[PDB]
């Protein structure tokens, strides 16, 4: 007979693009606005396909591109209502602080009466301000941008979130134990709703990320090319925890009607330089395993060296810890660390910056209010960002350096196995059935 | 690793005939036009794709690991140095004097 027939609900899909909405698991306003995100299911379905093969290139994935877009918008939205610190940067007369880590000085600011003005003192870090020339300074960014205070109530701490597809679409993830970004993978499972993806922010060391399994996964757009970064993924995480011992104080200085901002008020106790601690023996073995994995992709001896240079954002390790922003040297880990064929730690002295140019797009900056009391944060290192020197046809050396080439690579580590796709439940198969 | 080779290193041909130069290498390749003391100018990229502005006479062919550069209908001001440029290695170019 060979009569056409229409089958509804058949397994056919093709590459497709769409918008994914937020979902969260489980009182105080959050920058991510997780209250808006719908609750996640108690037990997401993890159906696994039996015998099928598919290939995808994560570098062309748009899930990461959308994540960067909406995360950028979310930060902008949270800062719309609360005050902007535009008037603050005037001629500042600063000499030194009684307690060049921190500088103490004052400025003239408006009061309840607009015509009248008052003199108020405040504390700023040395790198926060810049010298006009003697003894006079201005905020690092007022002749090229406008600084806005971050709303004190919101908390910037990352909370796991689910990028969860809508109805009629599916997300394919394959659990190949060893598999880089590109290439086919034969064990692919369909998950409607993705798993936890913490929006951690860092520049040199990836922290609070999912660990690898069975291998030290290494991913990069092209190994031969030098511009593209190289992402490491460690199966055994390294515990890094550190605290700033200094005790701060909160002070309020005011510039307009109902508009108040918080500046560093005073230092309590003896001034002590903050630092961070890492294990000696554990970290060294971590790099040895990484060096071995890198060797087979180049067939040359692997060497490490510090960052070449640049602005403080990349040349120093940065992260979020209890509402404070850090910029640390992380140079002892990548100095003279050429690899051959105890109860001691690594000290990484560093300091804190208030005015931050995060989300490096022209136009605006941010200010992080200070908080009284010390901060403690313990994090686990999972993956590294590296950039090959690329010094031509080198004899046997391929010296490596750290540095985050682009911020988008922070989330590409956790999205290397994911792909949105549209499903068409219609088909026209051959059958002998024919309607009366 | 990246490998480069420019076998001829020198070529002298008449005007109006068909002339070409040979470069062998692995990876993306580009061709440039360098005069005496002037900045190089890009002729064709991605092996065979043409650039906007350069005359259509310049052309090339991608064959496996062998890269051609077809030059036909010569005019004056087209006599300058040619070299093939992979990401980081650039061997000395070849001259098309006459």
């Amino acid at each position, epitope marked *: 007979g060979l009569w056409v027939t229409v089958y509804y609900g058949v397994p056919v899909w093709r590459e497709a693009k769409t918008t994914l909405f937020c979902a969260s698991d489980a009182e105080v306003h959050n920058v991510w606005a997780t209250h808006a995100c719908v609750p996640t299911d108690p037990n997401p379905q993890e159906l696994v396909l039996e015998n099928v093969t598919e290939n995808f290139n994560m570098w062309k994935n748009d899930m990461v591109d959308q994540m960067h877009e909406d995360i950028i918008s979310l930060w902008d939205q949270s800062l719309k209502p609360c005050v902007k610190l535009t008037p603050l940067c005037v001629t500042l007369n600063c000499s030194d602080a009684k307690v060049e880590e921190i500088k103490n000085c004052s400025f003239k600011a408006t009061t309840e009466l607009r015509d009248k003005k008052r003199r108020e003192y405040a504390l700023f870090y040395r790198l926060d301000i810049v010298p006009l020339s003697n003894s006079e300074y201005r905020l690092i960014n007022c*002749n*090229t941008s406008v600084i806005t205070q971050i709303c004190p109530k919101v908390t910037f701490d990352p909370i796991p979130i689910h990028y969860c597809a809508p109805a009629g679409y599916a997300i394919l993830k394959c659990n190949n134990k060893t598999f880089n970004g590109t290439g086919p993978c034969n064990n692919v499972s369909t998950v409607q709703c993705t798993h936890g993806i913490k929006p951690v922010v860092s520049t040199q060391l990836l922290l609070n990320g999912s660990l690898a399994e069975e291998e030290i996964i290494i991913r990069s757009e092209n190994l031969t090319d*030098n*511009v593209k970064t190289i992402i490491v993924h460690l199966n055994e995480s390294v515990e890094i925890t550190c605290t700033r011992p200094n005790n701060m104080t909160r002070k309020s200085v005011r510039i307009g009607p109902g508009q108040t901002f918080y500046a560093l008020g005073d230092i309590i106790g003896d001034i002590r330089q903050p630092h961070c601690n890492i294990s000696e023996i554990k970290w060294e073995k971590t790099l040895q395993r990484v060096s071995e994995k890198l060797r087979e992709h180049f067939n040359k001896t692997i060497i490490f060296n510090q*960052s*070449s*240079g*640049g*602005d403080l*954002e*990349i*040349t120093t390790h940065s992260f979020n810890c209890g509402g404070e922003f850090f910029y640390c040297n992380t140079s002892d880990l990548f100095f003279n660390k050429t690899f051959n064929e105890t109860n001691s730690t690594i000290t990484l002295p560093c300091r804190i910056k208030q005015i931050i140019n995060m989300w*490096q797009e*022209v136009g605006r900056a941010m200010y992080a209010p200070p908080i009284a009391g010390n901060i403690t944060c313990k994090s686990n290192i999972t993956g590294l960002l590296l*950039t090959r*020197d*690329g*010094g*031509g046809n*080198n004899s046997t*050396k391929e*010296t490596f*350096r750290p*540095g985050g*080439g*682009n911020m988008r690579d922070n989330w590409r580590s956790e999205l290397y196995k994911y792909k949105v796709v549209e499903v068409k439940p219609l088909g026209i198969a051959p059958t002998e059935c024919n309607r009366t | 690793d990246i490998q480069m080779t420019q076998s001829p290193s020198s070529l002298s041909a008449s005007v109006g005939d068909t002339v070409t130069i040979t470069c062998q290498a692995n990876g*993306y390749l*580009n061709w*440039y036009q360098q005069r005496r*003391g002037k*900045a*190089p*100018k*890009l002729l064709i*990229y*991605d092996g065979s794709k043409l*650039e906007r502005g350069v005359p259509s006479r310049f052309s090339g062919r991608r064959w496996g690991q062998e890269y051609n550069l077809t030059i036909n209908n010569l005019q004056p001001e087209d006599i300058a140095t040619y*070299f093939c*440029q*992979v*990401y*980081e*290695f*650039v*061997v*000395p*170019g070849t001259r098309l004097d006459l």
Partner: nanobody
Amino acid sequence: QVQLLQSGAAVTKPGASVRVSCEASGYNIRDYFIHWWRQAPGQGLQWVGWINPKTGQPNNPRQFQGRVSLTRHASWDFDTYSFYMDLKALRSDDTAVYFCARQRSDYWDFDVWGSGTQVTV
């Protein structure tokens, strides 16, 4: 409209330092890399490195490693970025001409080049 300015040729005694300035104003500088090349007499081009306009992270071969330093400095407005190049020690064989290029579209193709600066030792 897209063009690059260049500093004038200068000559310095051995052991001194030299400064070469490149400017880009005809496009969105932050979206394209900048690369530096050296053209010594008697041989072909020699690579120097690149500087990312978004963040001044250099990348240089071992031959010039530790001496050449690439720095960027935007103007008052985010246009007409100026790219510099400083090296500490000059050898007797450093005489060459330094160019200023641009990378785009994932391909090491340089459609814009600087006039070049000739420096002796």
